[PDB]
Amino acid sequence: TSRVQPIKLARVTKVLGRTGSQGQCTQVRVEFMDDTSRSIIRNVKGPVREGDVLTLLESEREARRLR
Amino acid sequence: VVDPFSKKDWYDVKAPAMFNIRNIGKTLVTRTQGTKIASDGLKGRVFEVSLADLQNDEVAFRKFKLITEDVQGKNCLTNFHGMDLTRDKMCSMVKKWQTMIEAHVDVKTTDGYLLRLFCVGFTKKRNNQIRKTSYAQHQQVRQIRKKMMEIMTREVQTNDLKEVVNKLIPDSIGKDIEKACQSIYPLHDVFVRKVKMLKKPKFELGKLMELHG
Amino acid sequence: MRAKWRKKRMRRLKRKRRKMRQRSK
Amino acid sequence: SLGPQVAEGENVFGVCHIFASFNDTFVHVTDLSGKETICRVTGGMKVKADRDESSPYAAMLAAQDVAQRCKELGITALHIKLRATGGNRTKTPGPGAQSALRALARSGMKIGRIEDVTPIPSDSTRRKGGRRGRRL
Amino acid sequence: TKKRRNNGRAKKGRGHVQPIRCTNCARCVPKDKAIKKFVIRNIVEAAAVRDISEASVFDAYVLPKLYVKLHYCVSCAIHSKVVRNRSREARKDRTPPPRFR
RNA sequence: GCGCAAGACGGACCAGAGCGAAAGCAUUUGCCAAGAAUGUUUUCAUUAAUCAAGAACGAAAGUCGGAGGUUCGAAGACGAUCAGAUACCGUCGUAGUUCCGACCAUAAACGAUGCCGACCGGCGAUGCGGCGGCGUUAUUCCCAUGACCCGCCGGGCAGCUUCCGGGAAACCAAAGUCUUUGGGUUCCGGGGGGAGUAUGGUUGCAAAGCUGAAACUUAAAGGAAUUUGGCGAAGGGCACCACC
RNA sequence: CCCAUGAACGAGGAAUUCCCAGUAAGUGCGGGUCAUAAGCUUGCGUUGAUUAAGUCCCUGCCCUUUGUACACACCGCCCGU
RNA sequence: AGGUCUCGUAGACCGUGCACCAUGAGCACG
Ligand SMILES: [Zn+2]
């Protein structure tokens, strides 16, 4: 990479199904505080409520399958 | 033993005056090592360029062939060699439940240029059309093909290469074909698929001077 | 035993018997 | 050896021919004329195993090596010429092409127009194998 | 016994259909019998599209697509999970499955 | 990357679409010749379908003469796989695969359903020709033309439903109109093997093709469709004696 | 029961077991065995957590569909020299 | 004159592929 990128905050909206081979990961619809328009899908680990605020490092990538 | 990039040069290629931006890239060649010269080895090169890298804001999926045949030092001047289309556009235009019409015309310009004009053509489903087929009869296809043949052999023999290269930059021949063949079958997707150049005249340097302006 | 190779072997046996008959006479 | 004019905001353009089969990955970088190559690396250059010649990891290693090489040479803008094995064989590109392209982009390099230039035939000769095919 | 109303193909008034080669295999399968796959994809899909998006010299540059057509032998079609098998009453559904994803 | 030379093949458009008696037929253009269907208040007036002898055509492979050998590739050579491979796999590779003429007449040549003709439900689309009727377009006015829409007619490739009916059932607008058994007319089958074998005739350069038994042996060999079964078949569900 | 003797053991490879709330774990006390008798088992009580409110990846089980020349039911039937 | 237009959500594939299968000694009872 060799690039700098600021930490961008996030906020979940609706919980989705739980992906992963053993069901470890979880899909969730997650949305940014400072950019109200755009909303992406990210793979999260751990128990998530239905509206808690989340901290995200990279906002470029998108969620996928277990692979 | 020695690094091969020490005895190298750098040269600039020039688009002809029919285009807008004369700078399209740079190439490199070795020095005049021994008896051989670096002038002829820089000659036989084909420079594939896109239309958007030459003009400002137009169709960007048109490709052009440029070939050099004269050098004077730290500079190269090109010439038209052919016109092609990108593969993704060609694969995107073809689809099921429609007909494809293709023809090729061998034409000779006012100069010593034996070109070869290709074409495509695809019929259009109407807006209120319920039928999923939208095919055409064979004689309708023959008439449309003959119309394309006479249109593409109408506009080349009476005029030179420069203004027909100027005419090839926008959609002119395809729009003329689509306007002409509207009564036979309302096709919508007309393009000149490929332009191939077969014969070269005797090369003289004044044409390359006045071609680039 | 499918019929194709059985017919092939029987054809070979018939050819052997016929060519033995023509070497005998 | 280097670009003579100063690059303030502009860039120089070469082409990079990626050729990805199902058992090898070629990264070949050539000038805009198409005749004069500058440096080439293959998937067998960066691994001592004949089976991992078409690998995402070998593609990343080859892409990083060729990106570094054209970085000291002085080319920073690349045109991608992607290619499969073509011909009468399959037309789907190998899995190492995407990883090689991503690793070439991750090195800090500017690209231009990308396309596929695989040699698709109209109708070629008979395919390799029998009528019943390569059954296993 | 008779399995289908047709004979696994679409030949109704022809007798001979120009055979084609398989993609994974090299079987000489007739054209109307082989399962045809037409997939529309692009060069990069999710793992490198943003990485190209902030590494391109042209802004708003749409990625070109790749268009290929695949011919599958029946054994290769079952083995690659392209087509499955249904019950007796559910075999006579000529509609394609709903392509949600 | 630039050209040159040779041979093969015409993708994507390509369809439960078209033509042909059947094998079969896909770059453009030109020439010759043939044909279905549609239309007809044109002509002849019973000239009609089936057909033993006889005759033409007939996929691939195989044979006989030569510049053609690009690719692919029976036999053969090599390396692995394996307990054992002269099999699955990989690299070369002869004869062929290509053309011109002379041969043979065999396929799951299958819609596993001879040909002509009459009758007996509906529906929605497809291809050809003809007919009728609002509207749009080849820009704005008027005609017919091509494209589109709404119906109808005749022939054809086909699709969905059923107490019309049939069938052992799969299924069938034909495989229906059959004990309430007769429209006309060719070929062909009599348990399973032996056996498409022996012999004879016939055709062919050959390979083989057609015609085609007996002795002996056997109580079964077979066709549809249900219930757990068994899949190195595909899914779905459950479990801290499974996992995270 | 009393006094001396004071070894290995420095948190253990491959592999593997048990467990979602007064639970695991630490801790002691009863009963069985008993003339003499608990490093076992069954009950009782004290202190008292980390993690999770899912998955079919592994290990097994169950169901549906499909194929069958198998029905003493694949440890089945079965071809040839 | 305002500055972050409003509402709801599958948008999920993508170096992923597997060798090694020979044989079944038989089989009740009314
Ligand atoms: Zn295959």
PDB file of N, CA and C and ligand atoms in Angstrom, chain D residues 127 132-134, chain E residues 21-27 29 71-77, ligand 1:
ATOM      1  N   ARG D 127      -9.279 -29.780 -31.955  1.00  0.00           N
ATOM      2  CA  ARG D 127      -8.757 -29.638 -30.604  1.00  0.00           C
ATOM      3  C   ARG D 127      -7.940 -30.866 -30.214  1.00  0.00           C
ATOM      4  N   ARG D 132     -14.006 -38.706 -27.490  1.00  0.00           N
ATOM      5  CA  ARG D 132     -14.549 -38.786 -26.142  1.00  0.00           C
ATOM      6  C   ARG D 132     -13.869 -37.829 -25.174  1.00  0.00           C
ATOM      7  N   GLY D 133     -12.828 -37.126 -25.609  1.00  0.00           N
ATOM      8  CA  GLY D 133     -12.239 -36.071 -24.812  1.00  0.00           C
ATOM      9  C   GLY D 133     -11.262 -36.574 -23.771  1.00  0.00           C
ATOM     10  N   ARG D 134     -10.791 -35.628 -22.959  1.00  0.00           N
ATOM     11  CA  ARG D 134      -9.858 -35.922 -21.872  1.00  0.00           C
ATOM     12  C   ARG D 134     -10.665 -36.356 -20.651  1.00  0.00           C
TER      13      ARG D 134
ATOM     14  N   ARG E  21     -17.263 -28.907 -29.569  1.00  0.00           N
ATOM     15  CA  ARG E  21     -16.386 -29.439 -28.538  1.00  0.00           C
ATOM     16  C   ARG E  21     -16.738 -28.848 -27.179  1.00  0.00           C
ATOM     17  N   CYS E  22     -16.479 -29.623 -26.131  1.00  0.00           N
ATOM     18  CA  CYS E  22     -16.706 -29.165 -24.771  1.00  0.00           C
ATOM     19  C   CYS E  22     -15.590 -28.216 -24.338  1.00  0.00           C
ATOM     20  N   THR E  23     -15.818 -27.530 -23.218  1.00  0.00           N
ATOM     21  CA  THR E  23     -14.843 -26.571 -22.708  1.00  0.00           C
ATOM     22  C   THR E  23     -13.860 -27.227 -21.741  1.00  0.00           C
ATOM     23  N   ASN E  24     -14.367 -27.795 -20.645  1.00  0.00           N
ATOM     24  CA  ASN E  24     -13.504 -28.539 -19.733  1.00  0.00           C
ATOM     25  C   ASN E  24     -13.046 -29.847 -20.364  1.00  0.00           C
ATOM     26  N   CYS E  25     -13.978 -30.600 -20.933  1.00  0.00           N
ATOM     27  CA  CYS E  25     -13.657 -31.817 -21.657  1.00  0.00           C
ATOM     28  C   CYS E  25     -13.388 -31.465 -23.118  1.00  0.00           C
ATOM     29  N   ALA E  26     -13.241 -32.483 -23.961  1.00  0.00           N
ATOM     30  CA  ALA E  26     -13.128 -32.283 -25.400  1.00  0.00           C
ATOM     31  C   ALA E  26     -14.114 -33.176 -26.140  1.00  0.00           C
ATOM     32  N   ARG E  27     -15.268 -33.426 -25.528  1.00  0.00           N
ATOM     33  CA  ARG E  27     -16.263 -34.317 -26.106  1.00  0.00           C
ATOM     34  C   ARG E  27     -16.930 -33.679 -27.317  1.00  0.00           C
ATOM     35  N   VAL E  29     -19.915 -33.119 -28.641  1.00  0.00           N
ATOM     36  CA  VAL E  29     -21.319 -33.101 -28.242  1.00  0.00           C
ATOM     37  C   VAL E  29     -22.100 -32.326 -29.301  1.00  0.00           C
ATOM     38  N   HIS E  71     -19.623 -24.079 -23.595  1.00  0.00           N
ATOM     39  CA  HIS E  71     -20.350 -25.284 -23.963  1.00  0.00           C
ATOM     40  C   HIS E  71     -19.921 -26.412 -23.038  1.00  0.00           C
ATOM     41  N   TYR E  72     -20.892 -27.046 -22.392  1.00  0.00           N
ATOM     42  CA  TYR E  72     -20.631 -28.050 -21.371  1.00  0.00           C
ATOM     43  C   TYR E  72     -21.170 -29.400 -21.815  1.00  0.00           C
ATOM     44  N   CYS E  73     -20.340 -30.432 -21.702  1.00  0.00           N
ATOM     45  CA  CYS E  73     -20.843 -31.793 -21.783  1.00  0.00           C
ATOM     46  C   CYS E  73     -21.671 -32.103 -20.539  1.00  0.00           C
ATOM     47  N   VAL E  74     -22.535 -33.117 -20.657  1.00  0.00           N
ATOM     48  CA  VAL E  74     -23.515 -33.407 -19.610  1.00  0.00           C
ATOM     49  C   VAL E  74     -22.832 -33.897 -18.338  1.00  0.00           C
ATOM     50  N   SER E  75     -21.819 -34.755 -18.479  1.00  0.00           N
ATOM     51  CA  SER E  75     -21.041 -35.195 -17.325  1.00  0.00           C
ATOM     52  C   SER E  75     -20.272 -34.036 -16.702  1.00  0.00           C
ATOM     53  N   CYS E  76     -19.712 -33.158 -17.538  1.00  0.00           N
ATOM     54  CA  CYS E  76     -19.053 -31.963 -17.026  1.00  0.00           C
ATOM     55  C   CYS E  76     -20.052 -30.985 -16.421  1.00  0.00           C
ATOM     56  N   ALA E  77     -21.297 -30.986 -16.907  1.00  0.00           N
ATOM     57  CA  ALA E  77     -22.307 -30.093 -16.348  1.00  0.00           C
ATOM     58  C   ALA E  77     -22.762 -30.559 -14.972  1.00  0.00           C
TER      59      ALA E  77
HETATM   60 ZN    ZN I   1     -16.301 -31.518 -20.893  1.00  0.00          ZN
END
